[PDB]
C-alpha cells in the first residue's frame, strides 16, 4: 500500500523527467532583457497607526481596501488620497481582505476564524456586517470573491472552503493539504484556483468537481504566497527559502527558479503585471525586487518601507503598484 | 477642485480625525498574550481576573486598560501566526503544577510537565519575542501539595535528587522554568503561585506590566 504509493510517486517523477526535453532558460535566450525599470512613488497614503497585512485592488483600478490592527478596514481613493470608507472591526487581528468584482462587498478574515462580508451600497450609509461566515477550526489566511454570492477562503485547519454567502453555509469542501494553507488566488476565468500550503506543495483545485487536479512539489520548505498568470495556465509561487518558482499547469512541472545569493529572507507576496512579463515580489529584507517572467533577472528595486513588507499586488489595468508593509503606509509605485 | 471633491476631502479629514482618536485610544491600552495548555487552568485564571477563534478579555485595574487574547482554541500551526503578536506588552504563560504525574492523553508516552517545558522553550526562544517578558503562572498549588505528599517529584524527572518538600519542589520547578531562558538580560520571567484571591492575581499582573512599561519608557528615553 505505502510501497505502492512510493512506486506511483516514482512513476510520476519519471513521467515528469521524460516529459521535459529543453530547459526554459535556454529557450528564453533569444528575447532581449528589459533593462533597468525605475518606479517612483506617486502617492503616500496615511491613516494607519498599526501593522498592515493585506490589500485588494478594485476592478476600476482606483479603489483599494487595506487591513490593519487598529480594528479598521479603510477603503481608499488612490488618485485623490481620500478615504472612501472606514470599517470598524470586531476582531482586531486580521490577516486578509478582499474586494468584490462588482464593487459591492468587502471581506476580511484572520485569527477569529470568522469571515465578515461588508456591504458598501446600502441605503443606511454605514458599512455594516452582512454575513458572518463561521465553521473554520483554523485561522483564515486568504479570501477572494468569485462573485457577490460565492467566496473562496483559505484557513488554518488545512481546509479550503467555498461559501454560499446568501445561504451562509459552505458548498464545496477542499481538503488534502498537510499543514495550513497560507494563500490562494483566483484565475481570470474563475473556474479553478490553486492554493499553496506549508508542506511545500501547491494543489490546483476545481470549483465544480471539488477534487484536486494537480500538485507540485518543487519547494524546499513552505509556501507563503501564490498568484496566477493572466492567461490562467501558470502561477509563480513565493516561499521562505528566498526562492520564487513558476509552475505550468499543462506541462505539470517547474518552469523557472528565481534566486539570488545574499537574499536569504522569505517571500510574503507575489503579483503579475498586465502583460504578465514583470514578476513583482515582496521580501522580508525591507526590499521589493521586480523580476522578469522569461529572462529571470532583476528589473527594478523598490525601497522606502521602514518595516517588513506584508503584501504586494499589481492593479487590474496595470497602471499602478501599491506595496503593503508593516510600517502603516501604502505607497503607490508607477 | 469641484464641490464633491471638496466634500470628499472634508469626509477624508473627518475620517482622519476619527482614526487619530481611535489610535490614541488604542495606544494607551495594554495587550497581553495568554499561553499554555488547555488543562492548565486558563478559564479559571481568566474568570478570577474578571471578578473557536481568539477570546478577548477587557478589564481595567488602576486606570490601566488590559487586552488579554486567549489563543487556546486554535489548533493550527502556531509558527505561521506567531509573527502577528510582535508588538505585545507581555506574555502570560499559564501551566499547572500538578501536570507531572498526569500523563498526556495524546500518546500516553510523555509527561505533561515536559511538554509544558518544550512549550515554554518554543515561546521563550522565539525570534519575535526577544524583549517581551513572560509572566509565568503556576496553577493548582494545593493539588500540587497533596500530590507531592502522596507521590514524590523524583519519578517524573530522574536527575532531580532533592528531598520531598513542598517549598523545595516548588522552588526547583520555578528554577527549572527559569533555566529554559537563553536571553536573561533583556527578558524577565515573572513567576507567581496562583492563589484563590483575585486581588493578588490581578496585582501581580499590574506590577509586571508596570515594570515592563518602566522598561519601555527607559528604552524610549534611551537611558537603558
Amino acid at each position: 500500500l505505502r510501497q505502492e504509493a512510493e512506486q506511483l510517486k516514482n512513476q510520476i517523477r519519471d513521467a515528469r523527467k521524460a516529459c521535459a526535453d529543453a530547459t526554459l532558460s535556454q529557450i528564453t535566450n533569444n528575447i532581449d532583457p528589459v533593462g533597468r525599470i525605475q518606479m517612483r512613488t506617486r502617492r503616500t497614503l496615511r491613516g494607519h497607526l498599526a501593522k498592515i497585512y493585506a490589500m485588494h485592488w478594485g476592478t476600476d483600478s482606483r479603489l483599494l481596501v487595506s487591513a490593519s490592527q487598529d480594528g479598521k478596514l479603510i477603503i481608499w481613493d488612490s488618485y485623490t488620497t481620500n478615504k472612501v470608507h472606514a470599517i470598524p472591526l470586531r476582531s482586531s487581528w486580521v490577516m486578509t481582505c478582499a474586494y468584490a468584482p462588482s464593487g459591492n462587498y468587502v471581506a476580511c478574515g484572520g485569527l477569529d476564524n470568522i469571515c465578515s462580508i461588508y456591504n458598501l451600497k446600502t441605503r443606511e450609509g454605514n458599512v455594516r456586517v452582512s454575513r458572518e461566515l463561521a465553521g473554520h477550526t483554523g485561522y483564515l489566511s486568504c479570501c477572494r470573491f468569485l462573485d457577490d454570492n460565492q467566496i473562496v477562503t483559505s484557513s488554518g485547519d488545512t481546509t479550503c472552503a467555498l461559501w454560499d454567502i446568501e445561504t451562509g453555509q459552505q458548498t464545496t469542501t477542499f481538503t488534502g493539504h498537510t499543514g495550513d494553507v497560507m494563500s490562494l488566488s483566483l484565475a481570470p476565468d474563475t473556474r479553478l484556483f490553486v492554493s499553496g500550503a506549508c508542506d511545500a506543495s501547491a494543489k490546483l483545485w476545481d470549483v465544480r468537481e471539488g477534487m484536486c487536479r494537480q500538485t507540485f512539489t518543487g519547494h524546499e520548505s513552505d509556501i507563503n504566497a501564490i498568484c496566477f498568470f493572466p492567461n490562467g495556465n501558470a502561477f509563480a509561487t513565493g516561499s521562505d527559502d528566498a526562492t520564487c518558482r513558476l509552475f505550468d499547469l499543462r506541462a505539470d512541472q517547474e518552469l523557472m527558479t528565481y534566486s539570488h545569493d545574499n537574499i536569504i529572507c522569505g517571500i510574503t507576496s507575489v503579483s503579475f503585471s498586465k502583460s504578465g512579463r514583470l514578476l513583482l515580489a515582496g521580501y522580508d529584507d525591507f526590499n521589493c525586487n521586480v523580476w522578469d517572467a522569461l529572462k529571470a533577472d532583476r528589473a527594478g528595486v523598490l525601497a522606502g518601507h521602514d518595516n517588513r513588507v506584508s503584501c504586494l499586488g499589481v492593479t487590474d489595468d496595470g497602471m499602478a503598484v501599491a506595496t503593503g508593509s508593516w510600517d502603516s503606509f501604502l505607497k503607490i509605485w508607477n | 477642485l469641484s464641490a464633491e471633491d471638496k466634500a470628499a476631502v472634508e469626509r477624508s479629514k473627518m475620517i482622519d480625525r476619527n482614526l487619530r482618536e481611535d489610535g490614541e485610544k488604542a495606544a494607551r491600552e495594554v495587550k497581553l498574550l495568554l499561553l499554555g495548555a488547555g488543562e492548565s487552568g486558563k478559564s479559571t485564571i481568566v474568570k478570577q481576573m474578571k471578578i473557536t477563534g481568539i477570546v478577548e478579555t477587557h478589564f481595567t485595574f488602576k486606570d490601566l486598560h488590559f487586552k488579554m487574547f486567549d489563543v487556546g482554541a486554535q489548533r493550527s500551526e502556531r509558527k505561521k501566526w506567531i509573527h502577528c503578536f510582535e508588538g505585545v506588552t507581555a506574555i502570560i504563560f499559564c501551566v499547572a503544577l500538578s501536570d507531572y504525574d498526569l500523563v498526556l492523553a495524546e500518546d500516553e508516552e510523555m509527561n505533561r510537565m515536559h511538554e509544558s517545558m518544550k512549550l515554554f522553550d518554543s515561546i521563550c526562544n522565539n525570534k519575535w519575542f526577544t524583549d517581551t517578558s513572560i509572566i509565568l503562572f503556576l496553577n493548582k498549588k494545593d493539588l500540587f501539595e497533596e500530590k507531592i505528599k502522596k507521590s514524590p517529584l523524583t519519578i517524573c524527572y530522574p536527575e532531580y535528587a532533592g528531598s520531598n518538600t513542598y517549598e523545595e519542589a516548588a522552588a526547583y520547578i520555578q528554577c527549572q522554568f527559569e533555566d529554559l531562558n537563553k536571553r536573561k538580560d533583556t527578558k524577565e520571567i515573572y513567576t507567581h503561585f496562583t492563589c484563590s484571591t483575585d486581588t493578588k492575581n490581578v496585582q501581580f499582573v499590574f506590577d509586571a506590566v508596570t515594570d515592563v512599561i518602566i522598561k519601555n519608557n527607559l528604552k524610549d528615553c534611551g537611558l537603558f
Partner: single-chain antibody
C-alpha cells in the same frame, strides 16, 4: 430611511419660525444635508447646505444672511432658523441627505415637504416646457447649461430628477453615466458639455411627471425650469 418635516403653517411676514426634521433608519451624522424649496406654480430651488460634522456651510445669494442652518448629531434632527421672512418665501421646504465619496449617489433620498404660506452663476435652461407623449414611444428631454460641466477629472456634474405629482421627487441619473439605486434601465442619460439629452424608452404612466436638470459644479446650486410630460 425616513425624513419627516415639522413646523409649517401660516407665518406672518417679518416674523420667525424654526423648522425641525427628524431622521430615522440611517446614520444622520455621516450625510450632508440640503434644503430645497419649491414654489407652487414654479420649479424647485436650492436654499442651503451643511456638511457632515458642520465643517462647511453654503447659502444661495438670494437667501444669504436671513436663514441660519444648524444640525445636532446626538438628537438626529436638522434645524433651519428663519429670520425676517419675505413674500417670496412661500415655498415647500425639503430635507435631502447626501453622502460624498467616489462612486456615491448624493440627493438620493428626499423629504416629504412642509407647507409654508406667507401673506403680504451657472444658468440651467430648459429648452422645452411641455411635450405631449404617448406610452410606448421614446421620449427625448433636453437640458442646456450656461457653463461646461465637464470637470478635468472626467466627471460631469448633472443630476436628473423626477417629481411625481403629489409625491416627493426622486433621483433618476447621477453624474450622467450612472443610474440611481432603484431606477430601472428605462432611463438613460447622454450628451456632452452645454448640450444634454435624456431618453426614456418603454414609457410608463408612473414615469409621467416633472423632470429637472440640476448642476453640482459650484455653489450656489441653480436648478432647471422643469420639463413636464402629459398623456
Amino acid at each position: 430611511v425616513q425624513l419627516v418635516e415639522s413646523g409649517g403653517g401660516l407665518v406672518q411676514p417679518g416674523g420667525s419660525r424654526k423648522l425641525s426634521c427628524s431622521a430615522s433608519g440611517f446614520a444622520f451624522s455621516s450625510f450632508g444635508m440640503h434644503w430645497v424649496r419649491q414654489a407652487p406654480e414654479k420649479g424647485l430651488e436650492w436654499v442651503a447646505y451643511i456638511s457632515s460634522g458642520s465643517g462647511t456651510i453654503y447659502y444661495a445669494d438670494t437667501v444669504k444672511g436671513r436663514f441660519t442652518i444648524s444640525r445636532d448629531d446626538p438628537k438626529n434632527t436638522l434645524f433651519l432658523q428663519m429670520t425676517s421672512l419675505r413674500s417670496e418665501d412661500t415655498a415647500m421646504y425639503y430635507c435631502v441627505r447626501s453622502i460624498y465619496y467616489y462612486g456615491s449617489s448624493p440627493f438620493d433620498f428626499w423629504g416629504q415637504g412642509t407647507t409654508l404660506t406667507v401673506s403680504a452663476d451657472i444658468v440651467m435652461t430648459q429648452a422645452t416646457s411641455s411635450v405631449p407623449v404617448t406610452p410606448g414611444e421614446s421620449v427625448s428631454i433636453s437640458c442646456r447649461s450656461s457653463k461646461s460641466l465637464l470637470h478635468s477629472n472626467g466627471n460631469t456634474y448633472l443630476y436628473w430628477f423626477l417629481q411625481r405629482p403629489g409625491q416627493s421627487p426622486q433621483l433618476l441619473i447621477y453624474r450622467m453615466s450612472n443610474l440611481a439605486s432603484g431606477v430601472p434601465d428605462r432611463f438613460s442619460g447622454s450628451g456632452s458639455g452645454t448640450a444634454f439629452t435624456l431618453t426614456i424608452s418603454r414609457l410608463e404612466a408612473e414615469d409621467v411627471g416633472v423632470y429637472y436638470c440640476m448642476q453640482h459644479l459650484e455653489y450656489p446650486l441653480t436648478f432647471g425650469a422643469g420639463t413636464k410630460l402629459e398623456l
